[PDB]
């Protein structure tokens, strides 16, 4: 410090730093731990123990196994050598797991399997067969529409918080229309998605395609719904 | 007839269709009849559709919880701070309640706003989708499901849609000894559509996603200069039709 | 920082380098046949020549400019380092 | 305690950011599945990487 | 109230501009998708020429 200067503060004007009125002497002053305690369990189905981490701390304050990473202190985990594909993301590429009796271990986690093509300027790989793969893919497209009455919840019954509430200006307003607005977006994103044909178009009553089988894809005549039964397991799984 | 369409879209050609009408037919069924195990097994799958459901729900008993709050007044309820107290110190605890119970509605609507955005760009998602994998066959990687896409077909869901998507996959691959192009009379030939391979011994031409040797000959290839450019080039017989 | 606090990325810098430097191996090697399936090699010229036929020009003008074509590109690939480190507000974005 | 809930609502609006963080990050760069390998002889036709 | 208020505000820029991110992040994986494990027909878009 210079001579005449008592404390020192810091970029965003906190006091960092301080001279002893008694001796002429300078300290730091750094802010006591905290930080965020999480726990790790492997689900009460399967076992009961667990792991705890508390977040960025030195493992020499939280005073069994006991582990330092760049994510914080870990207790209860036993840590390994070997490398396996995530299970439980802690940070900082270290995953745990419950593996083999039985404990909760932390690792690093495995990219993938290594490979090595065979290069060379004079060979070529081609394919003598081909499979036929079906994937499936699920997006959502609308949402629940609602509707707010704002007195009703404000004020419930009484007049005098009405007449209260209407000194506050148009601020009931404003809530109502985006409401209705987002109601009318959601219409317009269904519409937007199914309604894209001009015809309903209907299979012919013979349903014979060369050996192809669509009979999972189909709407089935039994069922009132007249769902397919991929549908119907769609709509009972929700 | 439509089938072997597509796989002609896909640069193979038709008679491999015609050859392995069966096969492909078994191998369609087989793969579409595990689609409902595939599904049940995990129930993780849907779970993103159940994901929005939930989220709604949330919101909305939050917005119920903040009725039964004092916030800072006497009391949450109204009607004990009408009886018990006189008009002058009534008027602050009304005013102090109103403000409290409007900024948890504005707070309400802008996360409604933010979701409601969200969902219009995943329903913008899902129209293209629609358009481009289901009436019609698209080149786009990766866009409609993995391989080379064949086709797809939409089903309904409760808030959603689900997409299955039909792909080529290849197999089974082997590895041959190539050469760009084959000198036979000073000039250079090059393969009109496909690839030439050798088995150590002979020279074919095959068609690059399925393995199918054939003869080279006037009609697969065509001339191009000398045999002098070319690095790589190996010496051949270019076989002529024209043998009356 | 009074209450508040940074958390760390699951991903470090290492793997997505990795992950990168993966991606690059399996297109040099095996060009595009990598994505839809299992990687198949071929030579890199030979590549070059389906993608010069993917946009409507014959093999043969690949195969008779091939030293140029090599050069121009190495030339190209050489000036990315000096462009990019001469204007400072080129990574702005990040 | 006596205003309310407000800091469950932040916390999980927070931690709903943090990990969509991750998923977007995860979203680009992991899409092989097997770490290839460049051969030891770097010769691909005069073509320098 | 002063402090909540504060902490409300920040907590909506933080959602308005982890949308953003996300949308940009969208956008980078389908380009991976379609430029580098592919050829592109779409002008402009791997590029201009
Ligand atoms: C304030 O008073 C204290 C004593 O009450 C001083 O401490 C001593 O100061 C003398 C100065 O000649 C030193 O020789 C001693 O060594 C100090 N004591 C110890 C234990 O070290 C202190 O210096 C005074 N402060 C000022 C600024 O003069
Ligand atoms: C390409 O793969 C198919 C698998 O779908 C092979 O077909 C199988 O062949 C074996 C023996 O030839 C039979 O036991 C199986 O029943 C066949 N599967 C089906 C679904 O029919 C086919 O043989 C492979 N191609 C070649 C040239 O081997
Ligand atoms: C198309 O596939 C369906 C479903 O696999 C077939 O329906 C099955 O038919 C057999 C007849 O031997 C019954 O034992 C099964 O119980 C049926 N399954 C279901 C889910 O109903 C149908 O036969 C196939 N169509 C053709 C022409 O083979
Ligand atoms: C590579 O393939 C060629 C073409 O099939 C083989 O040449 C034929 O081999 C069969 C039996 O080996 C003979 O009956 C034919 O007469 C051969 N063709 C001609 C034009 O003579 C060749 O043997 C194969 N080489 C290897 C190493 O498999
Ligand atoms: C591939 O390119 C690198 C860099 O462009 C070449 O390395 C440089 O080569 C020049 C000569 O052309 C030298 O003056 C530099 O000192 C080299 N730099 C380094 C870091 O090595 C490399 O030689 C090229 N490969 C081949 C086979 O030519
Ligand atoms: C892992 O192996 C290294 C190699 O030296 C060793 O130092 C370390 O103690 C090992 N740790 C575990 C948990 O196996
Ligand atoms: C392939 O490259 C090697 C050098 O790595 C060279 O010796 C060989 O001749 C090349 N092959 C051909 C067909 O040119
Ligand atoms: C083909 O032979 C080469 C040897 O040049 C080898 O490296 C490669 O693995 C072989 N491919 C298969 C599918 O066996
Ligand atoms: C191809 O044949 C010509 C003429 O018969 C000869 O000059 C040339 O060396 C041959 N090429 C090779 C690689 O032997």
């Not at chain 1, 790989?125 to 707010?148: C, D, G, R």
Request: hydrophobic share 35%; charged share 15%.
């Amino acid at each position: 410090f210079l001579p005449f200067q008592q404390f020192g503060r810091d970029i965003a004007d906190t006091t960092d730093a301080v001279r002893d009125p008694q001796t002429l002497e300078i300290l730091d002053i750094t802010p006591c731990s905290f930080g965020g305690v999480s726990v790790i369990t492997p689900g009460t189905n399967t076992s009961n123990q667990v792991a705890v981490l508390y977040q960025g701390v030195n493992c020499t304050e939280v005073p069994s196994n006991v582990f330092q990473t760049r994510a914080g202190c870990l207790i209860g985990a036993e840590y390994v050598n070997n490398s396996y594909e995530c299970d439980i993301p802690i940070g900082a590429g270290i995953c745990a797991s419950y593996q083999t009796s039985q404990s909760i271990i932390a690792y690093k986690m495995h990219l993938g399997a290594e490979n090595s093509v065979a290069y060379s300027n004079n060979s070529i790989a081609i394919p003598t067969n081909f499979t036929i793969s079906v994937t499936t893919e699920i997006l959502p497209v609308s949402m629940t529409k609602t509707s707010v009455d704002c007195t009703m919840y404000i004020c419930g019954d009484s007049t005098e918080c009405s007449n209260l509430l209407l000194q506050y200006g148009s601020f009931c307003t404003q809530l109502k229309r985006a409401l209705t607005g987002i109601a009318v977006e959601q219409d317009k994103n269904t519409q937007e998605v199914f309604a894209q044909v001009k015809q309903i178009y209907k299979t012919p009553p013979i349903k014979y395609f060369g050996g192809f089988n669509f009979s999972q894809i189909l709407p089935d005549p039994s069922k009132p719904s007249k769902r397919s039964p991929i549908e119907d397991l769609l709509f009972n799984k929700v | 007839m439509q089938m072997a369409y597509r796989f002609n879209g896909i640069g193979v050609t038709q008679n491999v269709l015609y050859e392995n009408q069966k096969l492909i037919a078994n191998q369609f069924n087989s793969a579409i009849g595990k689609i409902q195990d595939s599904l049940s097994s995990t129930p993780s799958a849907l779970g993103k559709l159940q994901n929005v459901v939930n989220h709604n729900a949330q919101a909305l008993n939050t917005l119920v919880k903040q009725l039964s709050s004092n916030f800072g007044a006497i009391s949450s309820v109204l009607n004990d701070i009408l009886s018990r107290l006189d008009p002058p110190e009534a008027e602050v605890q009304i005013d102090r309640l109103i403000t409290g119970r409007l900024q948890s509605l504005q707070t309400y609507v802008t996360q409604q706003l933010i979701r409601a955005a969200e969902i219009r760009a995943s329903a913008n998602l899902a129209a293209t989708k629609m358009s481009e994998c289901v009436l019609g066959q698209s080149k786009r990687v990766d866009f409609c499901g993995k391989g080379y896409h064949l086709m797809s077909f939409p089903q309904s869901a409760p808030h959603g849609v689900v997409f299955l998507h039909v792909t080529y996959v290849p197999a089974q691959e082997k590895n041959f000894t190539t050469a760009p192009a084959i000198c036979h009379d000073g000039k250079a030939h090059f393969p009109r559509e496909g690839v030439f391979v050798s088995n150590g011994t002979h020279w074919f031409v095959t068609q690059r996603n399925f393995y199918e040797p054939q003869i080279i000959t006037t009609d697969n290839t065509f001339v191009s200069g000398n045999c002098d450019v070319v690095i790589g080039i190996v010496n051949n017989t270019v076989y002529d039709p024209l043998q009356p | 920082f009074n209450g508040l606090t940074v958390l760390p990325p699951l991903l470090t810098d290492e793997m997505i380098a990795q992950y990168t430097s993966a991606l690059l191996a399996g297109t040099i090697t095996s060009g595009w046949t990598f994505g839809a399936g299992p990687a198949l090699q071929i030579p890199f010229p030979m590549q070059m020549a389906y993608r010069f036929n993917g946009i409507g020009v014959t093999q043969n003008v690949l195969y008779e400019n091939q030293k140029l074509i090599a050069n121009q590109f190495n030339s190209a690939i050489g000036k990315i380092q000096d462009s990019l480190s001469s204007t400072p507000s080129a990574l702005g974005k990040l």
